[PDB]
Symmetry: C2
Subunit: 344 residues, 2 copies
């Protein structure tokens, strides 16, 4: 313990779950989000699954406002799109920086993780309680025990798609899991991850009672590849999509395309450009594209962490604002309708 | 719905009572760390060598290997500081045998409590003969059971980018080598060393086997391991010059893995990589402070024979002697250059 400063007590999952119960609405919402997401990625439904919302959540009330606008849009476009809100609680850093709402809910380097788990769970109940399903990046392998009952979708980030621990984690999650392609822009690691996660694994993990035990998973048949560009370039276009389709094994689920990150080339204004190219593929009969991801907030851009934060603006990566989001989604729903025409 | 179930797990503290370190084991681990630190931080002009099997599946074969390695270590100690690879955890490309801890019987029964007892008994057995050991830290819970015996940890190419493994390293009491990425570039290993040098706060399992919030202090003894990848091998002078060019101030010396990416998928290339690395060292390259060698009693591998790897192919004992004696010579030559 030369490099361990200390340990602080942590409430168990079971304890937090009693303290912050899911409402029946929250639970039905999470189940429905899972059902719709499965039906889409497995080709039973010809709608597109859309994971859309903030790069990260740092503000429960602004997250609620965003959610109410998203749910309204989602009610309008539900013939064409199954919408899940990005409610991301955990942020992998290039080196160091704010890791998200759980790790440091006060965003002031006090690292009050019990309050962070309380805030995260309260947030997930608040969003799902209005009938809006949520998804998050599953970065921590312990935190999902606190939150999994409320979640309809998990992502594994580009920096952890290759990680055996994250493939083991995904193999035991009760909802669909998207693996990002690697930061270098190649697909093989995400295809490999979906294979690995489809198998049962045995590994040490923390239970609802907060104790380590040996977990046996069943394997998760609802993992899919997310194309998110990378060093080798963007990969949302028809040729990259064809390339991806060629690498997918029998039994594979549909592809999801992330408009942001590697596919935006360091500029949120590019998300609508990626939309137009993806919509052209879909409208013209591409059925292997079953999902998209969009980094969207109330207002566009991002800001520094100095509290004196501007309302409704990301404190991590730059997002498109709400108004651009509505345009992009209506455009995407139009493309879904056209694809239906092509398929008849 | 996707959890079949949970089986009880002995706590780290329990297993530490059940399989105690000897005083020699503890001293050996401490010495291994001191020596590795002095090398990677430039205090000592010997080279640090992490050498031994791709993986351990057989404690008796590992012991006989250790006894040969400890004897060679005593011969070459003015020039090399040797730590044995005792790798218990193996990351797979998709699926396959994950190593001794996960499935000690190698038959898909997954008796993790027995794997942890075999792992700890193995680590005691090796350090008890005065030979320090090192392992890849894949599992973030496993180190609680074994850390007192370990002098070096590696983070594999597939997990150098993972925030969880950078957090882990920041709290380990020994030097940690981050492998470069599977694409063959070093940026992610440089970033990882930066990240692991900082204090972190995260949920982790304690010695009593319960989850708690850990605060780490940061690990200043992390270094980059050059291990090739898609982009090509990276053990040559140009690769080393490019690597030194991206190291921040305060960086530790580089380690070169002779195997994996650097071997073009062919264990017989490790002595060729040795020649090229020796030539740089002998001629005055002081940034190369460590090497890593996949070595066993007998050469090659086998699919799932005594002294032969069941994972990646290794060089055999005799080749290993020759490689390490040549390396030692290169170290002596570098001392001459630096005068």
């Amino acid at each position: 313990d030369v490099r361990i400063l200390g340990y602080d007590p942590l409430a168990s999952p079971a304890l937090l779950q009693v303290q912050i119960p899911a409402t029946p609405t929250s639970l039905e919402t999470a189940k429905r989000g899972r059902r719709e997401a499965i039906d889409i990625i497995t080709g039973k439904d010809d709608r597109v699954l859309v994971i859309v919302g903030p790069c990260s959540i740092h503000d429960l009330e602004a997250a609620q406002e965003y959610a109410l606008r998203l749910k309204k849009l989602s009610d309008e476009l539900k013939g064409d799109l199954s919408i899940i809100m990005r409610a991301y609680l955990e942020k992998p850093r290039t080196t160091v920086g704010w890791k998200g709402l759980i790790n440091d809910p006060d965003v002031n380097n006090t690292f009050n993780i019990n309050k962070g788990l309380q805030s995260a769970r309260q947030l997930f109940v608040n969003l799902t309680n209005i009938g809006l399903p949520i998804g998050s990046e599953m970065l921590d392998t312990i935190s999902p025990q606190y939150l999994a009952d409320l979640v309809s979708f998990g992502a594994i980030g580009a920096r952890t798609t290759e990680s055996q621990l994250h493939r083991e984690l995904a193999s035991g999650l009760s909802f669909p899991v998207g693996f990002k392609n690697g930061t270098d822009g190649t697909l093989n690691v995400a295809v490999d991850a979906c294979q690995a996660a489809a198998h049962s694994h045995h590994f040490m993990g923390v239970t609802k009672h907060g104790v380590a035990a040996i977990t046996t998973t069943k394997g998760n048949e609802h993992c899919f590849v997310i194309l998110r560009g990378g060093k080798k370039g963007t990969n949302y276009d028809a040729k990259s999509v064809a390339e991806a389709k060629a690498q997918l094994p029998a039994g594979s689920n549909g592809l999801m395309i992330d408009y942001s990150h590697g596919n935006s080339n360091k500029d949120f204004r590019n998300q609508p450009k990626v939309n137009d190219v993806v919509c052209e593929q879909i409208a013209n009969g591409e059925n292997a594209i079953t999902g998209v991801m969009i980094e969207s907030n109330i207002n566009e851009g991002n800001q520094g962490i100095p509290a004196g934060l501007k309302y409704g603006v990301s404190i991590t990566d730059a997002c498109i604002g709400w108004e651009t989001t509505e345009d992009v989604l209506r455009k995407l729903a139009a493309a879904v309708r056209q694809r239906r025409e092509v398929n008849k």
